[PDB]
């Protein structure tokens, strides 16, 4: 709920470049400034002879929102011989996937084609470039001597990537072995130390790779998506990967051991062609230090109230348990054909309540396919099934849908305000948007009505001016608040009380406030963080018995408190927000004594 949607940071790239197809954070290992990494896989480059080679842009923060390309490779195509190119970089989609860990940045071109040295071919093996700092090396683990579709010639290595916490790479190649797909994992140390530009197929020791299997597994697309997380409690991140054509289009998700690529766990979809496995994510969502698996099936069809199938998408949440099992739950999309679940982004603890949170994108929902992103907060039982926030794209396109939410990245506190922030790409409008998380104020409110029971016959209070004898009682409302992260010391609260709120339009209200002789009482207030329970008392009374003949329904004393957000701003311009999970209304009720 605490993401700032009023003034996000908006970044654009060249028209038609698919700027925003992939997004990440960059946190260099010098406690330096932080940047955004945005993939623009159809962008034109200065590489001689290359058309739409793609690029990865580094975008500054709070310095006029400027992006400059990262020079991974300035060169065009190498030649095997005169007029015989060794490789083909045009339309290679460099920047389709970008991942960064500390100093290192990994970006891949899943449609890079390579000729091979024996014959004239154009095999989309894919290639990646790894920039560790001053040094940049190529990393094309599928550009091997295992040629052709039956080998790794159509592997499209780099289709999906990730880093393990121990600086291993996880690479997905959905085309290997007649589209069985393949996962490959190499130590970054190997990737840079074994790099020799004179050798096109590099022998990395300690490489982990899935193996060719029986033909029945063809056309499964292993490596369509990947995530990492420990799932046998040995501290070594394991490999999660979506396999969306597996099990005759039901889809599957494989988990392999991050130490030997042994198979650990499997998930299987429930519906034909729901594209189960289009996206995967691993994050502890319920605060037990056991990573939990999220699997998106964007084309999943639901049964509607009328019994008609309706394509809304579905995400499954699998809570890891020490016993090795998983505790699975399903989450359904909201709009037809919106493809809820195309992207799943761990957010970290967005609201800093103790449980991590997650964003799930519906890139084709909203008005005129503008796209929608749903925020789901975690809790000890799992994921909160009702989204606490709804982000909506703001741009339309005249060619391809904006696809706001197609890519997302969170879990990085870019502005150092104490809460992680979210990047959302919208490649159909060549846009990427950073949403900063506002801080959260938790408020403890108490309301006391004494005496609880009211006797009409008992009158001890005098009315304002020159009037006498009204049955009275005391209403005391109290307020206390605190917050985490950069916050103002003083907070301006506005409180309102309503006596006998039960009685709606056209019905008599039996209780009135002494001074005001009205059933409502407003009150501005001011409380400081971590301060004491600043209270305030006022006195109410009852109407003459002659005016109301309902003495049976209780008299509820309703209290509301809200905040004016403009006054609490920061140097960032970031107003704090009230904790949405604690209700901002409280009510007690008094009763008329009967005889």
């Amino acid at each position, epitope marked *: 709920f605490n993401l700032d949607v009023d003034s996000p940071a908006e970044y654009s790239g060249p028209e038609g470049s698919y700027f925003g197809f992939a997004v990440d954070f960059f946190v260099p290992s010098a406690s330096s400034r932080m940047f955004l990494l945005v993939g623009a896989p159809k962008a034109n480059t200065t590489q001689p002879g290359i058309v739409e080679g793609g690029q990865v842009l580094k975008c500054d923060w709070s310095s006029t929102r400027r992006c400059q390309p990262i020079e991974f490779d300035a060169t065009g195509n190498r030649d095997y011989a005169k007029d015989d190119p060794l490789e083909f970089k045009s339309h290679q989609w460099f920047g389709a996937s970008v991942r960064s860990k500390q100093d290192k940045i990994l970006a891949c071109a899943p449609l890079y084609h390579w000729r091979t040295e024996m014959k004239q071919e154009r095999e989309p093996v894919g290639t990646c470039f790894l920039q560790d700092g001053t040094k940049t090396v190529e990393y094309a683990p599928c550009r091997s001597q295992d*040629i052709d579709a039956d080998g790794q010639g159509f592997c499209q290595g780099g289709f999906s990537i990730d880093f393990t916490k121990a600086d291993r790479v996880l690479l997905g190649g959905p085309g290997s072995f007649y589209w069985q797909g393949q996962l490959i994992s190499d130590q970054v140390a190997e990737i840079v130390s074994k790099y020799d530009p004179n050798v096109y197929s590099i*022998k990395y020791n300690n*490489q982990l790779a899935t193996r060719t299997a029986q033909a029945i597994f063809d056309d499964s697309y292993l490596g369509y998506s990947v995530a990492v997380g420990d799932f046998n409690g040995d501290g070594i991140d394991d490999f999660v990967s979506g396999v969306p054509r597996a099990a005759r289009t039901l889809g599957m998700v494989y988990i392999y051991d991050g130490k030997n690529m042994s198979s650990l766990y499997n998930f299987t979809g429930e519906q034909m062609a729901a594209y189960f496995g289009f996206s995967v994510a691993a994050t502890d969502i319920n605060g037990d230090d056991y990573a939990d698996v999220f699997i998106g099936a964007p084309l999943f069809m639901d049964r509607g109230s009328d019994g008609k199938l309706q394509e809304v998408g579905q995400v499954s949440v699998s809570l890891q348990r020490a016993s090795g099992d998983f505790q699975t739950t399903k989450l359904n999309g909201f709009e037809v054909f919106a493809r809820f679940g195309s992207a799943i982004a761990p957010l970290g603890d967005l609201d800093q309540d103790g449980f991590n949170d997650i964003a799930i994108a519906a890139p084709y929902g909203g008005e005129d396919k503008k796209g929608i992103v749903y925020i789901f907060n975690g809790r000890s039982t799992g994921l909160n099934a009702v989204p606490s926030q709804i982000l909506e794209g703001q741009w339309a396109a005249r060619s391809c849908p904006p696809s706001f939410g197609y890519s997302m990245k969170g879990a990085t506190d870019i502005d150092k305000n104490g809460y992680p922030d979210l990047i959302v790409g919208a490649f159909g409008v060549d846009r990427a948007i950073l949403y900063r998380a506002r801080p959260v104020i938790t408020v403890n409110a108490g309301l006391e009505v004494y005496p609880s029971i009211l006797n009409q016959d008992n009158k001890t209070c005098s009315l304002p001016g020159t009037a006498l004898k009204v049955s009275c009682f005391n209403v005391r409302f109290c307020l206390k608040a605190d917050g985490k992260g950069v916050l103002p010391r003083k907070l301006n609260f506005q409180v309102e009380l309503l006596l006998d709120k039960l009685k709606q339009k056209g019905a008599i209200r039996r209780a009135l406030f002494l001074y005001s002789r009205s059933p409502s009482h407003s009150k501005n207030m001011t409380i400081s963080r971590g301060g004491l329970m600043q209270c305030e008392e006022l006195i109410a009374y009852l109407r003459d018995e002659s005016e109301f003949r309902d003495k049976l329904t209780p008299i509820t004393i309703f209290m509301e408190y809200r905040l004016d957000y403009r006054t609490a701003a920061d140097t960032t311009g970031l107003q704090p927000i009230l904790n949405q999970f604690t209700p901002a209304n409280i009510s007690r009720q008094a009763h008329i004594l009967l005889d």
Partner: antibody
Amino acid sequence: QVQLQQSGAELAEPGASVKMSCKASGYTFSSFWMHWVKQRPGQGLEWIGYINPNSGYTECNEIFRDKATMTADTSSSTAYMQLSGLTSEDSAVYYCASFLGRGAMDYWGQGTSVTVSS
Amino acid sequence: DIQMTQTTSSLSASLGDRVIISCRASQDISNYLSWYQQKPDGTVKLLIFYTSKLHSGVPSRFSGSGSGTDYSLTISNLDQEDIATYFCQQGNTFPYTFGGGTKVEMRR
């Protein structure tokens, strides 16, 4: 830390067959071709051919077409060669060598001597 | 098939000397020539590939040059452990073919 370990010396009578192994370690055995080289005592290096371990496809020098058949067990990262119809002219050291690319073989086994006598 | 020929089958050299080993191909092999060292005990190493590319792990003393049909390996500052036999090998066309070799022995 690439290493190719070849099986021990082989003795076979004339007309028999032998089969030697070459176990790879330190790289992904499936992603690289394995070559085979013949060297007679005091003589030079002769090229037999190569195998694509993941597909079983092979190409041979015309000399050794009928004489040698190459195979590969990917589960054990082992390439095998079998010599058949053995003569005294087959007595030699037989090397396995991984394929670097660029028309070169970057790592060599220690060789397996084959002696053919009665 | 391409015939490779190392005209000198053997040569002598003292420590520190520069040894230049020659190799010639019957046809143009488009700079696809490699050099291998074989030691007395049968050990074989790759030294140079694609005419002038140094294989990882081998010392900078070894270097290779050439084009078209004529190529040469060069040992600068001959080390004791360089006493060996050196073969050239074209990789431009199948079948791969070697030169006869050139033995290097210490002068005495």
